[PDB]
Structures are given as structure tokens and as C-alpha cells.
Amino acid sequence: FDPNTQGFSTASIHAGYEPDDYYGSINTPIYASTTFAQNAPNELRKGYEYTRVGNPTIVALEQTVAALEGAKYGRAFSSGMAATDILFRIILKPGDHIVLGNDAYGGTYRLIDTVFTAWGVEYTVVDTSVVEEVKAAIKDNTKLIWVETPTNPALGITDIEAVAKLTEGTNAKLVVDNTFASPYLQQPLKLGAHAVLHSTTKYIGGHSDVVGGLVVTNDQEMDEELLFMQGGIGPIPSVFDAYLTARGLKTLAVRMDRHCDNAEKIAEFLDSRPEVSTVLYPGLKNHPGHEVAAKQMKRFGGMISVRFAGGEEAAKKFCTSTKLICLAESLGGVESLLEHPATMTHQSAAGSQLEVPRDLVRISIGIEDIEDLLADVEQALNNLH
Amino acid sequence: FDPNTQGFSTASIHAGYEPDDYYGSINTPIYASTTFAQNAPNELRKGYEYTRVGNPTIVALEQTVAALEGAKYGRAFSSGMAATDILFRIILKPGDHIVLGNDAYGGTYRLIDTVFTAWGVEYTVVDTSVVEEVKAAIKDNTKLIWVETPTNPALGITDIEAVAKLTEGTNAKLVVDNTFASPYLQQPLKLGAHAVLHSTTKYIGGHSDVVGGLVVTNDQEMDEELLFMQGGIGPIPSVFDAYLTARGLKTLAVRMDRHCDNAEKIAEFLDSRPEVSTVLYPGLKNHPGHEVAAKQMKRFGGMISVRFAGGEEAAKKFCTSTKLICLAESLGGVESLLEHPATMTHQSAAGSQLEVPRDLVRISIGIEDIEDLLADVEQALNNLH
Amino acid sequence: FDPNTQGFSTASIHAGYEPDDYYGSINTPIYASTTFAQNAPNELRKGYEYTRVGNPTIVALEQTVAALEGAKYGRAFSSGMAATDILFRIILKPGDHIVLGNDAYGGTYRLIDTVFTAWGVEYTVVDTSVVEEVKAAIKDNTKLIWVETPTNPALGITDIEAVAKLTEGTNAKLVVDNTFASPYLQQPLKLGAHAVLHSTTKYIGGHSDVVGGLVVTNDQEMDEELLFMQGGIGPIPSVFDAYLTARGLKTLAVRMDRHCDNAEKIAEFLDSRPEVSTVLYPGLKNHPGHEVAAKQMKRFGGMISVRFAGGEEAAKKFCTSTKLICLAESLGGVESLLEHPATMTHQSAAGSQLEVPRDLVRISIGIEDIEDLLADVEQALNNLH
Amino acid sequence: FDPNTQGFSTASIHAGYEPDDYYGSINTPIYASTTFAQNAPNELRKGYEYTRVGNPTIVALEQTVAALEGAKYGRAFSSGMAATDILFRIILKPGDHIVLGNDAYGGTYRLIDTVFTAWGVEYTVVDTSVVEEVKAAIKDNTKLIWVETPTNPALGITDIEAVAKLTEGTNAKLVVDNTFASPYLQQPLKLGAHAVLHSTTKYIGGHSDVVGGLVVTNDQEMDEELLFMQGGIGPIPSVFDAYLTARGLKTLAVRMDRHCDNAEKIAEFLDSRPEVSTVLYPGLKNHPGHEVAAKQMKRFGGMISVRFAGGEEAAKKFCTSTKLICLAESLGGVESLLEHPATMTHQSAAGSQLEVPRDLVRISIGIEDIEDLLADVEQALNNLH
Numbered sequence A, B, C, D: 001f002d003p004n005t006q007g008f009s010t011a012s013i014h015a016g017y018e019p020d021d022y023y024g025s026i027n028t029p030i031y032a033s034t035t036f037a038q039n040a041p042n043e044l045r046k047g048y049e050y051t052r053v054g055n056p057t058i059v060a061l062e063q064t065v066a067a068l069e070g071a072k073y074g075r076a077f078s079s080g081m082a083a084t085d086i087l088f089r090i091i092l093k094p095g096d097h098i099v100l101g102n103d104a105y106g107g108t109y110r111l112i113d114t115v116f117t118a119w120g121v122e123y124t125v126v127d128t129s130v131v132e133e134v135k136a137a138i139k140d141n142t143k144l145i146w147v148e149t150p151t152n153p154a155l156g157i158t159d160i161e162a163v164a165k166l167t168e169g170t171n172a173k174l175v176v177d178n179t180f181a182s183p184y185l186q187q188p189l190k191l192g193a194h195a196v197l198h199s200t201t202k203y204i205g206g207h208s209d210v211v212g213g214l215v216v217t218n219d220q221e222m223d224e225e226l227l228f229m230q231g232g233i234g235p236i237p238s239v240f241d242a243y244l245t246a247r248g249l250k251t252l253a254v255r256m257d258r259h260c261d262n263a264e265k266i267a268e269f270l271d272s273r274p275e276v277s278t279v280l281y282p283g284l285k286n287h288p289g290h291e292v293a294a295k296q297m298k299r300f301g302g303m304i305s306v307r308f309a310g311g312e313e314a315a316k317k318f319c320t321s322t323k324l325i326c327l328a329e330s331l332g333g334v335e336s337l338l339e340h341p342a343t344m345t346h347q348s349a350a351g352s353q354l355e356v357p358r359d360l361v362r363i364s365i366g367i368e369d370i371e372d373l374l375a376d377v378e379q380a381l382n383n384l385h
């Protein structure tokens, strides 16, 4: 398969597997085997030996996501968090420093601030939407600039190409967590990022039924260290999960186009309502970084955050008033979800500059019919009065 | 379910799940969901929120293995290696020291020696079968004594109770990797170990189809830190894998009794043959530590290692001559396997005191009929001449 | 959930399952259990006893497809064929008669003609696109008129409402095999059909990884007999397959809209090429029954058949020349497929009026990028010269 | 693999699959694909085309069970009932007759008596333990003698060889439903049966998590008709279920030996108690047909039925008093179950000669520790007083 000559929807179905030369099954077989027979000691039959070191069903997934990012290399992990931990352990050692943003998944922040600081790593938080702030925070020991764009949950936007330029003449690498945009909307390697991280739990799987992570790169050395760590630390996905993830990925383009259609309409409806003080959606002209988003994103995504004029009580009542959109953690599935980040996904950021306003609700707009989602949002807003 | 009043086979089926109060399915449902609806923000319906932080199908497995070890607490991970890495990160920090044995899974050693030494951890290798050697190696900064018994691949034996006594008056914890014995043959917590590790990839799953790890303890603080890390680093098992693992575990006693029946007979047959210089099997009277094994193990296991009088060429030819026993990595499945550790599972120990003799073959004796396994071993031995 | 007030995409995600009142998982749990504990003899805990008689994971699927058809009742089976066999056995007995069309899945025809005629059932084949031909073939013993529209493989069109009117004053029931249109494009119960059949193997699952069938109706007596036969003959789906099918169904609308976008463009391109004698696609103005299709179908589907001016040799060479579209049986998956019906899916119709022209290729247009599918078709057409 | 030279436990692991010549996975891959690429129209790559007509994962299972029965041929189905229905449809036509026993699975009886009699088939019920009664019931139109031994639920015993001799000079075939004995305890083809049926739902799977059926034979014509019907009627198993079934089958010998150990001890304990009027267990010297069972069965099985001196009230109270043995339908899993057949599995036999005494409880003795099962039975018996 050649990624450079085929479209995204084509690649999402065909980049990882073609019907094999044995039976020719249309889909990758599920190789639920921990081991593989060898033809003689350490002479492998067809490249595989032990599933923690490699399995074809997992490699199919890896190759697919790599192709969708414009990447030669990809490696999969048991979760987005485990992928982040492995990338941290490759890039950093005691005495090194990270530049991190001021709006970010609470789990990323918790890992740095609770775990990696106990192992000798330093960090600085900055507003990554201000290129000069990032530039000022880079020290001689900075090995990593960690960017999420759009950020979770406020949907803040960073200019990837501009921040990548800052790493020239330095030993810093730029890693973009591309979970919210997905590879369908944004390809950070093409703008100068060194590596890209995904939680495949979210949009790539798309069906809220498999936890997973994945790292992609064009750096063969980085691919070798990801493989070394995949096998040597062992946070590897199940073959069943890697099959389910890849299955979901086959509909990413059609899903995301509907998520973005729906979110544009719900954001416009929220922006007309006096219960709402602020709609956070990258496609709105006044959203901070809108012009950066429109240059680097194909569309503006399925996520919306909303700040309520009636404060935390209104935010929480909105959370318990919806009847189609479900109150739950996570995002990026076909079903619509909502949550209150200050008490739920980002309770771990309390006390830090990443702490989220208590009047804020984060909504993952699914692929249900827009008329039904508009009706549910409207009735929930009317339940506040 | 009460573990203290029921037998091992009973617990292996019933300690993790009883038919629920909703539908009453005989087996734990497979909760292939990343998230769970809440009744209000951060008010959970029945204890679950997000699968990386907890899922009922995974907790069923955890509770089952905990009960089989005489443990109050258990936590599952994506692999034996990932479980080891998490336990290392809980117990150690920069500046701390580990005492490790001289025969051990090459992956354990690689993790310490390549990764943890780069993060400021020190270690010392000793022969853990010599209690005085362990005692001498404990320093004021020793936080961990890591014991495997029987060891992989030489089946060396450590006196768990004796080594546990060494940790009194110290800040060292004893962790036993109980993979080879399984909880059916040996219960290190009852002899004073602080925690127990398993690769469930091996005997606990038993069917060579799921990679997994698990840690058990009676220390509630340790359970809290395992949970924190499970969720915060995220090397969590798939729900499908945790179901398959627990499914396999339901036959552990009946499997292991057949593995041990078969291995006793194959070890006796090997001990009569002049092609063999040494049979390594804990149940043989001259195996080093046999008397220690007979005190702390119910039976002597399914693993045998063999050293060939004709050296490496004979070891490798034996590997390619068997027709029922398969040449492959791994162990503890219903099918019989064999491998050459110096070139395969322990190639990573080359150069170290853990390096394995090149004349050594490690055999995982399965549950096939003994007459057929004896016939296969006999014909393979006759192929050397 | 109320189907009558929510949209198709909403229903496809939410009509079968809402997060339960036990744990609240976002998705239906996989109840991989053959049996369920009872509270006393034949006093069920929550409606379930034995999976062949009923399982919640299967009922979730059933309820979802029923809602998408405007049906109160649905029952699932191991395959489209097994669903057809069960419906035949309910509606017919020895001495009864069926009216069948002249273009139909070869397996339907084989079942009638090889099996049911040996059990005393009679049939007549007619062109169901000619309402008067159907009317003339109805006898006093006719219990079933079996309609496929569009037909497999020629995409012939039947006026469902008109044929349903013919059953007034008779003991005949109209059953529509709605596999090719799916419930997203066509709802035969709303036009007077008595029951609707699907092979969920095709579009409803959508991922070419699960074989299944399903029958929907508004007749409660028919639902009772489908249940009786589901449990009493036992062609029941696996719980894993019913979960996978329902998972796929969550993207039916977004998939089908892309399949129809793509097929409209490929049909137009084929209609411009002199290698092609006839393009069979319901959306073309000259396709027989186009006006009937436009009244009863929302869009015209993802399937195209093509007859080649160079006869069978050209049809077969086209089959082996495509490099993205794969030569294989089946249809309705995200990947594009093609086949030669005379030698493959319809070889069983040889000798009958259903026999398919040897110059005919049937194409299942997937959801790949149109530019890549156009390029593949164009290069394959150029390989004929 | 050669079945004739290897033992049962060997075959149960190795008769269906050997590590392939492509990747060499230790276990059969799960081919979750409905279709397979062809090299040209109707030129298959490696024997497979469409999963309803054949799939390698299903064929692995089929070949395994065939080998365990001493059979050249095997074909799998979605349930035991669907397998029975297919075998009925092959062997019988309108006007033919069946000889059936007087104690039999209620579902078998329901299928004959409700469905097949409506299609022109006749039957006669006899006591199949009386060879002369079977002989007398054979007519010129008899095509099938259907034997279960031991019977469900009374554990009645039929002399297979003797009944097979009755079919000489006739057009009758003997089919044995070998579900309760399993192939580990009894091999009816070796005693003259024409075909053997299993519900793999029970012992062969062994884990109460997969519904399935299977038919084995040495008649190649019968294998061709089973294949024809498998594909043409389509009651085919899921690939996931066929993998799970075969996984379970790998421990059949070790499971069954423990089930039989346990059942012998529970039957002896029940036979000492005055609450019990009759213990039905084939290994008891006074059980009718004990001497026949000891000739044709390796051991006497895991099932026990019990008739209570205090009648139906005592039978039902025993059912609700056990705390380890669970009240549920089904049998042959690792967990112990019990049920009241008159109200549960055999309510469908009410009114017929197959109707089961209301004082009768059927117990599926699992593989839990005997001390715990004895304790549970003893306490439940003491709850009657």
C-alpha cells in the first residue's frame, strides 16, 4: 500500500492489511497466540516470536495509524497514558526538563507532576498559544515540549509549525497529542512535530469499547526505542483490542465529518443563548486561535465546551438535565457525552495553573441526528429556569 | 465468597464473581465499555467511571487471583513485565537499591539493568539460594529483594521464609515472582513475602492466548499505590483478555496436576539417558534446594531444563527434532513447548552473571498424554546419534 | 427509547440499549454465559434463563434493527439464510405455495428448490417488477410472496406497496428481503410488507466480520413463532457476533451515505465507457423501475452491476484487473468488492430462470475515497484493450 | 496429525490445528472475516470463499471433535438443537419414521413432536434400554433410531452395540446424542452408531459461555450432506465461538476426570441419606443398565439425578437451599449447577411419556473441591428438616 498516493478513507481501510497470501481473509486475522513456532532456535518463521515483542494483528493497527499521520513508523500501547509514559521515558532522564501547556489532560499533568518529578525531571507550565512564552521557557536541559491542540477541555489552540521552529538549535523535541483532532483533521508531523501521540480510546476506535494508545514518528531511532520499550516494559494492547480499534478506524472519516457537522450546529445554537456566557469551539471566529486552527485543521472537531452564566450550579444542573447526551467521562465515540471537568476528568489539575473553571461543561458531540441533539440541548437549557 | 473456608478449585471458579443481582449470568459479563454513566457529576452509579481507572470484568480477575494467593488485594496489568515495572516504580526511587538473583527471567534483568540504572537505581546480583549471600548484599538503601523460585530457566530454589526474615529491621521488601509455581503450588505471602508477581501469560491463563500480569498483596497502602499507578500510568489489560485469563484460571488446579504428573515422568526418563548430563527439576533429590522446594511447594511444577552432554550442537538438534513438543518461546500452556534460552528468552542476559549455558534446553511440559510425550522425547534423543 | 420521535442515526446508537441501572456501562455488556441463575425453580431473575432461548446482548441488537424498520418486533439468527429458513418454516407447510422472483440471491432459490420442494412445498417464479405477473401467479394455496428489491445481482426493482395490495383477500404474506437497501434506504413494513428479512452479514454489520440474519415484523403472533423457532430449532447468533453487528450498525447512516455518494459517481463513470454495454444501478433514469425506486428508496444504494460488451472474457479480466476493489464474494462492507455471479454467488441458479448473464460483474462500492475507486475502475477498463 | 496413534489429551490439543506455515501462531487464528480474496473467479486461494460455506477457525474445531470420536468427518452448528434439526432434515423426509426413547432432552422431543410431525414425519417412543422394544418399533419406513445415553435427566442407559445390530437389513440409521458422556467417556461410532451428535454448549466447551453443536460420522456422503446443509440452511457458529469451544476442549480430559471423581463421591453420599428415595448415577450397581454402562463408558460421568422422599416440595426446597451449587439451567461447565426438570428444562415433555417426576432434581457436578460440594449438599439436605 502506498499512503502518499491514496486518500485518507482508502488508507483507513487498506494501509494496515491486505488479504494475505495464505488464506486471503478480507480482514486481518486475530492472532490470539502468545507465541509462534520457530523453524530453528531464534530463526523465526515470518518475523514473529512472542506477542509482547510483536504480533501481526497489532502491527496492522500500527501501520494504519502511521499511514494516516504521514508517518513511516507507529507503535501501539495499552492506553493513551501508557503511550505518554513510554514516550516520556525515551525522551527524558533525570535532570531533563519539559515545557507543558496550561490546559491539558489532567492525566498528562498528573503523570509529570506526581511521578516524573519524583524521578528527577523538572517542568515549566506556559501558555502554548503564546509562542514567545514557549520560547522563553526553553532551557539548556529542555528535552520535550508537550503540546495538545485543541486542548482538553478548553480547546485552546497552539501554532504547531511555529512552536516546532523553536526547537531548531536545541535538543528539545516537540510532541503533539493529536487525540482531539485525530489524524483526519490535523497532521502535526507535516508541521514539524517530532512525534505524535494518540489516545485511540477516543476517536480512532470511536465506539467507546477499547482503551488504547499509539505513537507515530518519522524518526527510525525513535521507532527502535518505542519497540524496545513496547517489548521491554510491556504495556502492549490485546490482539482483540487492536482488531476492534482498527475496525473502528475504518469509519473515522465518515464519523468525524458527522461529528464536525453536528458540533458546528450545536456551537452556533449555544452561542445564541443567554444561559451561556462563553462557547469554546475552534470554528467560532472569536475563539482564541481560530485563525491558527483554520490553517492547521481541516475542520474544527467534535468537542465543544460551554461556560454557564449561572456558574457551577447551572453547569451541574445542565449535566443532569440532558436525556440523549449522557453524563459520563471520555469522548470521541459515536454516542454523545458530557461532563463537568472540574469534578471529573480534571479533578487531578486542582491547585495547578491547569485547573478548570467550575462553570465549564465539556461536550463530546456524537453522530446522532442533529435535530435530536438540538432538542436535547434546548430542553436542558430550559430546565435551568 | 470466603477464601479462608473454601478450597483452591472452588475459589478459582467462584472467588471473583457470583451471578449478579441484575440478570444473574453464570459468568462475569464482558464490560466492553470505556466509560460508565454517572447519576450526577462524580456520583458513580456502582463504583465505576472509566475503564483505565477500573472495570468490573478486570476486578473479577484481580479478586480471583488475590484469593488464590491468600491475599486481600490484587491488581492486573497488560503483561508480567508491565506489572514488574509498576511494582519497581512504587518501591524504588533514584538512589535506592535492589538485590536480584543470579538466574532470572532475562526481561526482569533487562529492565533493571538497561532502564532503571539510567533512572538512578543501583543493584547487586547474588545467589539467592544462599541466604548469607542475600544477607550480605542488603545495604541501608536496599528497598527491594527480588526472588524468582523456581528460577527461569534453571529452576533454582530460594527459601522464601528465610529470605523474608532478612528484611526484619530493614526498609527492604521481598517480592516473589511466583509465575512458574503458580498459586496452586506455592503461596509466598504465607511465608513472608510483601508482594507476589505473576505473568498470567503463562499458567494462570494457561492457553497461550492472552498476555497479562498481576500483583497481589496484603498491604492496603501497596494496593492503593498499585491502583494509583494502574490508572495513572495505564498499563491496563483489555476486558476481553481479563475474561479469557479468568476463564483459563478456572482449570488451573486440574491443569497443573497433569503438568506435574507429566513432568515427574519426563524428568525421570531424562535422568536415565546418557545424552543428558544434568536434569534440572525441583522434585529430583539432588536438585539443589530440593528439600527447600519440598517444604514450600505442593508439587514441583511443569518445567524441566536439561543440559546435553554433546553441548550446544546437541541442545539445538534436540530442539529441532521433537515433533509434538513445539519449538517456541513461552511456557505454561496446555501444549508442550521447548526452547534454547541462550539464544532465545535469555539472549538479553548474555555478559551478565545470569547468562545461561549453551548446552541447556528449557521444556514446558503440557497436558498431552504422557505416552506420547515420552515417545517424542525418546525419538528426539535417538536423533542425536 | 421512542423510535417514532427520534431520527435514524439516533436510533441506530440508542434504540437497543441504554446505560443500565446496575453499573451503567455505556455499551451493552457482552453476556457470554449460556445460563442465568434463577431465584427459585422457573422464577427468573430478570427475564433470562438460557442463551438459546434469549440473551440480553442479542435482544439489544434485535430491538435496534426493529426500531430502524419501524417494527415492534425483531429476532436474530446465525445467518441470513437461517433467518430465511425459519421464516419459510413458520409461513409454509406441505401443500403450500410460494411466489418468487426471477432475480434473487442464489441461496434463497437453492433453499426453495432443493430443500423445500422435497418437503411438499410448491413454487412459481415470476418477474416481480410486473405486478400483473405476480397477481396471476397467486393460487388458493399461496402463503408467501418473496420479494428482493433491489435484486441480487441485477438490481431489479419491485413496487412493494403494489405487491402488498395483491395480498388483500388472500392468505398470502409479503416478505421483503431488504438486505441491499438496508433500513436506512427503504422500510418495507411502511409499504405493506408483513415481514422484513436481512442478512446482517452485509450492510448492517458493515465490516465483513460477522455472519448474521434478522427478521422484523409488527405481527405479535409472528414474533411469538420467530421466538419459538429461535429457541426450538436454535440457529441463534453468538453474543460476540450480536455485539459486533450492533457495533457496526451504529455507523450505518454515515456508511451508507458514503456508499451511495461513491456508487452514483462510479455508475456515471461506467455509463460513459464503450467497454460497458449496460450499467445496472437503480438511480439511472433508464434503469428498469427507476421511478418505483425513487418513490420507495431514500437513495439508490451502494451496489452496481455491469455487463461488458466483450462478454464473459471481458467480465473476468475486469475481475482480475482491479487493484483496490477486491475479488471476493459478499457485499456491504466498508471495503469495495467485486465478483462474477455466474461462477460465484449465483452458480446455484444455473439452469433456472434466475441464471445470471456471464458477461455480468457485481460491484459492492465501499467507502474508500472516490478518486481512488475511479482510478482503479479506469485502469482496469484500460487493461481490457 | 494421526488420531489412531495419539492419545485423547494429545488429540484434544493438536488434532485440529498445527502451527501454520505462514506465521506459525501456536493457536488457530480467529478468522473474523465473512469472505476471502480469490485469485480469479471461483479460483480460491486456499480453499475458503465465504464463512457460511467454510472458515478455517470453524474447521479446526470440527476436525478436533471428529478425531476425539474416532471419526473422519465433523461439522459444527450454532447449537445442539440446530445440529439435531439438520441431521433430522438429512435423514428424514415426509412419510418417514423415527424411533425415539422415553427419556430425552425435552428440546429433542419438542422438535419432533411440534415441528417434524407438521412436516409429515411419524414417530414412536420406546424404552431404548429394552432392545426388544426398539426392535418391535422399527417399521419399513423407519429411517432413524435416536438414542441418548445416559439420558437427560434420568441417566438411563442404552446398549449402543445392541441397538446398532438392529439396523442391519434395514434402512434405519442409529444416531447417538453423546452430549452427557462426551467423547472422553464414550465413542458410539466404535459400537456401530452411524452418526454422533453433541451439544458443545455443555462439556466440550466446558465454561458455560458458548452455545454450539456438532455432528460427527465416518460416512463421507453424510459429511457431504452436513456440509451442504451447513452452507445452504446456514446455522453456522461464530468464529469467536468456535475458537472458545476449541479452547475449552483442550482441557476436556482433565475436567471430566475431576467431574467423575466428584460425582462418584456425591452420589455415594446421597445414597446414604434418608431424605433421598433414589440416586440416579450410572456407576451405582443398582442403577438400571449399570453393567451396559460399565462396558461402553470409560467412567460414569458428572451428572447425578436425585428423587426426594418428600416429593416436589422437598425437591424444590433442595433447589433453593444450596449455596455453592447454583440453580440454573444447563450442565457440563466447570461450575456446579442444579435444576428441577419438570418445571425447567423438561417442562416441554409434560403430557408425554418423557414427562419427568416432580420429585426429581438434576445435578451437574462441577470441578470445585469435593469437600466444599459435600458440605453444600449436606447443609442443603439438613435445610429440609
Ligand SMILES: *Cc1c(COP(=O)(O)O)cnc(C)c1O
Residues within 6 Å of the ligand: A079, A080, A081, A082, A105, A107, A148, A152, A177, A179, A180, A199, A200, A201, A202, A211, A212, A213, B052, B234
Ligand atoms: C483521554 C486522553 C488521554 C489519555 O488516554 P487514555 O487512553 O484514557 O489513557 C490523553 N490525551 C488526551 C487529550 C485525552 O483526551
Ligand SMILES: *Cc1c(COP(=O)(O)O)cnc(C)c1O
Residues within 6 Å of the ligand: A052, A234, B079, B080, B081, B082, B105, B107, B148, B152, B177, B179, B180, B199, B200, B201, B202, B211, B212, B213
Ligand atoms: C514470562 C515471564 C515474565 C514476563 O511476563 P510477560 O507476561 O511475558 O511480560 C516474568 N517472570 C517470569 C518468571 C516469566 O517466565
Ligand SMILES: *Cc1c(COP(=O)(O)O)cnc(C)c1O
Residues within 6 Å of the ligand: C079, C080, C081, C082, C105, C107, C148, C152, C177, C179, C180, C199, C200, C201, C202, C211, C212, C213, D052, D234
Ligand atoms: C447474502 C444475502 C443473503 C444470505 O445471507 P447470509 O447472511 O449470507 O446467510 C440473503 N439475501 C441477500 C439479498 C443476500 O445478499
Ligand SMILES: *Cc1c(COP(=O)(O)O)cnc(C)c1O
Residues within 6 Å of the ligand: C052, C234, D079, D080, D081, D082, D105, D107, D148, D152, D177, D179, D180, D199, D200, D201, D202, D211, D212, D213
Ligand atoms: C442441552 C442438550 C441439547 C441441546 O443443545 P443446545 O446446545 O442447548 O441447543 C441436546 N442434547 C442434550 C442431551 C442436551 O443436554
Ligand SMILES: [Mg+2]
Residues within 6 Å of the ligand: A069, A070, A071, A186, A187, A188, A189, A190, A196
Ligand atoms: Mg502527522
Ligand SMILES: [Mg+2]
Residues within 6 Å of the ligand: A327, A328, A329, A330, B035, B036, B037, B038, B048, B049, B050
Ligand atoms: Mg464516567
Ligand SMILES: [Mg+2]
Residues within 6 Å of the ligand: B069, B070, B071, B186, B187, B188, B189, B190, B196
Ligand atoms: Mg501468596
Ligand SMILES: [Mg+2]
Residues within 6 Å of the ligand: A035, A036, A037, A038, A048, A049, A050, B327, B328, B329, B330
Ligand atoms: Mg517463539
Ligand SMILES: [Mg+2]
Residues within 6 Å of the ligand: C069, C070, C071, C186, C187, C188, C189, C190, C196
Ligand atoms: Mg420496514
Ligand SMILES: [Mg+2]
Residues within 6 Å of the ligand: C327, C328, C329, C330, D035, D036, D037, D038, D048, D049, D050
Ligand atoms: Mg470469496
Ligand SMILES: [Mg+2]
Residues within 6 Å of the ligand: D069, D070, D071, D186, D187, D188, D189, D190, D196
Ligand atoms: Mg464415536
Ligand SMILES: [Mg+2]
Residues within 6 Å of the ligand: C035, C036, C037, C038, C048, C049, C050, D327, D328, D329, D330
Ligand atoms: Mg437458568
